Amino acid sequence: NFNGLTGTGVLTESNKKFLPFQQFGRDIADTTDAVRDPQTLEILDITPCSFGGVSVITPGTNTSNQVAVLYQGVNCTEVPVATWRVYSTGSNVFQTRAGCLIGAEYVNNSYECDIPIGAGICASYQTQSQSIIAYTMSLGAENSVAYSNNSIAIPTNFTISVTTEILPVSMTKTSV
């Protein structure tokens, strides 16, 4: 409550210049990012507290009920937990480029993506005995070819296949 600038946040020490007449900081959207102390004449930098969004990674309710929780850009150990937070504040906490993942392991293997997460990380419900794993996306099996100055590979048999395709053509009319 500096002189009436009622607010909430964290106060740190800044290296701003703040010529003697100047005593407030400002930027876009009229946010006071710095302030001069009324008594000791020390400059302080104001930063908003930690905040973010959460996401729930679950398989279908038919298959099971275990879930995992992803916090958006928190860097885990920095402020993972300050009711709903009964998840041991642990149990294989993993860190990714998108945030903090709680409730999943990290297998060194590679499979096809099931539930996209972000930055080349997926999750699934594989059976080791039931758990939620968070592997790395696999682009497919690597294959080699044997280019040479004199070599051809001509097929000797064939196959006839049928492939379906679905396209919308129109939508329901309406009047108001």
Partner 1 sequence: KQIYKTPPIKYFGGFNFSQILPDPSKPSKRSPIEDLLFNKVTLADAGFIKQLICAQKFNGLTVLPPLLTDEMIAQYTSALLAGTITSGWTFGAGPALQIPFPMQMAYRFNGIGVTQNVLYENQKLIANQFNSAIGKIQDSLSSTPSALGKLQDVVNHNAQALNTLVKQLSSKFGAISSVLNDI
Partner 2 sequence: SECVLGQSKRVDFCGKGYHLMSFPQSAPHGVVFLHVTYVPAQEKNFTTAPAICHDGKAHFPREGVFVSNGTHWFVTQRNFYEPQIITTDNTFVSGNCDVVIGIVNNTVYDP
Ligand X SMILES: *[C@@H]1O[C@H](CO)[C@@H](O)[C@H](O)[C@H]1NC(C)=O
Ligand Y SMILES: *[C@@H]1O[C@H](CO)[C@@H](O[C@@H]2O[C@H](CO)[C@@H](O)[C@H](O)[C@H]2NC(C)=O)[C@H](O)[C@H]1NC(C)=O
Contact set with ligand Y (CB under 6 A): 146, 148-149
Q: Three-state SS for 29? A: helix
Asked if 78 touches ligand X (CB under 6 A), the answer is yes
Asked if 162 touches partner 2 (CB under 8 A), the answer is yes
Residue 143, burial from CB neighbour count under 10 angstroms (0-12, 13-18, 19+): exposed
Kindly state the smallest distance separating residue 139's Cβ from partner 2, in Å.
14
Binding test (CB under 8 A) with partner 1, winner from 65, 109, 129, 149 = 149
Cβ atoms of 69 and 103 within 8 Å: the answer is: yes
Q: Three-state SS for 102? A: strand
Alpha-carbon distance 123 to 172, whole Å?
A: 37
Asked if 159 touches partner 2 (CB under 8 A), the answer is yes
Comparing CB distances to ligand X, the nearer of 78 and 142 is 78
Comparing CB distances to ligand X, the nearer of 62 and 149 is 62
What residues make contact with partner 2 under the rule CB under 8 A? Answer: 146, 149-172
